[PDB]
Amino acid sequence: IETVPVKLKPGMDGPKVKQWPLTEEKIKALVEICTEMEKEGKISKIGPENPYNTPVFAIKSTKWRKLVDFRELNKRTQDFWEVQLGIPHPAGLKKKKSVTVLDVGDAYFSVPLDEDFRKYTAFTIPSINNETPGIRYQYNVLPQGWKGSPAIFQSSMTKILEPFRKQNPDIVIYQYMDDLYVGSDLEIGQHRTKIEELRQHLLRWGLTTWMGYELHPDKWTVQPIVLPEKDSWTVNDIQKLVGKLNWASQIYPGIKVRQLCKLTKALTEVIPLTEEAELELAENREILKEPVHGVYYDPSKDLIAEIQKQGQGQWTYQIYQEPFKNLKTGKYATNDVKQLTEAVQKITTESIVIWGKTPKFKLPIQKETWETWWTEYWQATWIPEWEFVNTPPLVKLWYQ
């Protein structure tokens, strides 16, 4: 085994990201992990000659796990992991009956990382009250979280999987970051038995290994823009319905509001439902049920996801590349943050399974509230890109 040489771009410089303050339990949880890793030769204490920094966090049943935020590095590595060694995405995966996800991160700890690239993997375990200098380390092996690790490993991964794949040609296996996506049309017990067989292939070589047990991507359906059913329609009830439909007409080709606009009245007054409006309404209903005409996935373009707080433990979301032209819409159903972090994880997983990439999330929360809390509930090995937005009150209403 030798090292695959890595390069950012001749102009692109490494990451220099601040470490978010960490709680006592997390710093202590990290010192344990980082010491064992240093002893095992996975990492190495570093000096000031390394001006680079990637944040570290600790996650969770009872065992603590080191999560490293490779967002900036992955952005700066891109050419290496997308073009130079890009893993292809199977269109089949999203069609499979059941999809099991397995953590294959332990495999990267066996492959050495290009000696010339290691400086960019620098991270810091901070000190409480800044009394001690703060422990610096860098990777020697392939790090978990960095998109370059699965790119390098793919060659060794294809070897491992070769028998299983030959033996089960109707099983689909995708590799996204530290995880394996395994899909089959098999009955549940049989799917589970195939996963177990798979674990063992990985066990030789060396691989121990908001969502249920597995994902069911064929059962995944778009939450339509719903038009309420009523026998009593007020002036306000129609006004809402007109505004909702008008907004949908910007996305859905075929939506008409004319017949409804055909009715200075008091909001509270009860206007009776016309023949042409009752038709238009029922017609629009059948349009919003079926997917959007004209919107397609452009691989070159970035995915964008919006989430709305619907209250009572309900959340709504929409995946698009070009604003409001929806690729997928859905829903998610104890505290606002735990719920959002849950919703985020679910949307990102669906996104991975469907397009082979994570969306940039538009978070209906204050920047600081999120950064402080997300880690307490975060459970994934990847971290999506996120921006903090103010949900326009209108969009919440339109998506129920």
Binding-site positions for Mg(2+) read: 103, 178-179
Q: Does 265 participate in binding another protein (rule CB under 8 A)?
A: yes
Q: How far apart are CA 36 and CA 56, in angstroms?
A: 16
What's the closest the beta carbon of residue 13 comes to another protein, in angstroms? 9
Q: Dump the DSSP string for 161-200.
A: HHHHHHH-TT-EEEEETTEEEEEESS-HHHHHHHHHHHHH
Q: Which of 61, 62, 129, 300 binds another protein (CB under 8 A)?
A: 129
What's the closest the beta carbon of residue 267 comes to another protein, in angstroms? 4
Q: Does 390 participate in binding another protein (rule CB under 8 A)?
A: yes
Q: Which of 5, 41, 92, 134 binds another protein (CB under 8 A)?
A: 134
User: Under rule CB under 8 A, which residues in 352-371 are in contact with another protein?
Assistant: 364-366, 368-369
Reading the block at residue 384, the tokens are 């999506």
Q: Does 281 participate in binding another protein (rule CB under 8 A)?
A: no
Region of 302 please: left (phi>0), alpha (psi -120 to 50) or beta: beta
Q: Which of 340, 347, 352, 383 binds another protein (CB under 8 A)?
A: 340
Give the residue carrying structure tokens 């080709």. Answer: 253
Q: Which of 335, 360, 379, 387 binds another protein (CB under 8 A)?
A: 335
Q: How far apart are CA 375 and CA 256, in angstroms?
A: 45
In b/e form, how buried is each residue of 175-211, taking b as 16+ CB within 10 angstroms? bbbbbbbbbbebeeeebbebbeebeebbeeeebeebe
How many residues interact with another protein (rule CB under 8 A)? 65
Q: Are 184 and 216 in contact (CB under 8 A)?
A: no
What's the closest the beta carbon of residue 61 comes to another protein, in angstroms? 23
Comparing CB distances to another protein, the nearer of 339 and 381 is 339
User: Under rule CB under 8 A, which residues in 35-74 are in contact with another protein?
Assistant: 47-51, 53
Reading the block at residue 386, the tokens are 């996120």
Q: Does 396 participate in binding another protein (rule CB under 8 A)?
A: yes
Q: How far apart are CA 85 and CA 82, in angstroms?
A: 6
Comparing CB distances to another protein, the nearer of 347 and 352 is 347
Q: How far apart are CA 347 and CA 366, in angstroms?
A: 20
Three-state SS for 304-324 is: EEEEEEEECCEEEEEEECCCC
Q: How far apart are CA 245 and CA 319, in angstroms?
A: 19
Q: Does 246 participate in binding another protein (rule CB under 8 A)?
A: yes
Q: Which stretch binds another protein (CB under 8 A): 200-208, 257-265, 282-290, 294-302?
A: 257-265
Q: Which of 193, 221, 239, 379 binds another protein (CB under 8 A)?
A: 239
Write out the residues near another protein by the rule CB under 8 A: 18-19, 21-24, 27, 47-51, 53, 122, 124, 126-131, 133-134, 136, 234-236, 239-240, 242-243, 246-247, 257, 261, 263-269, 308-309, 311-312, 335-340, 364-366, 368-369, 372-373, 390-394, 396
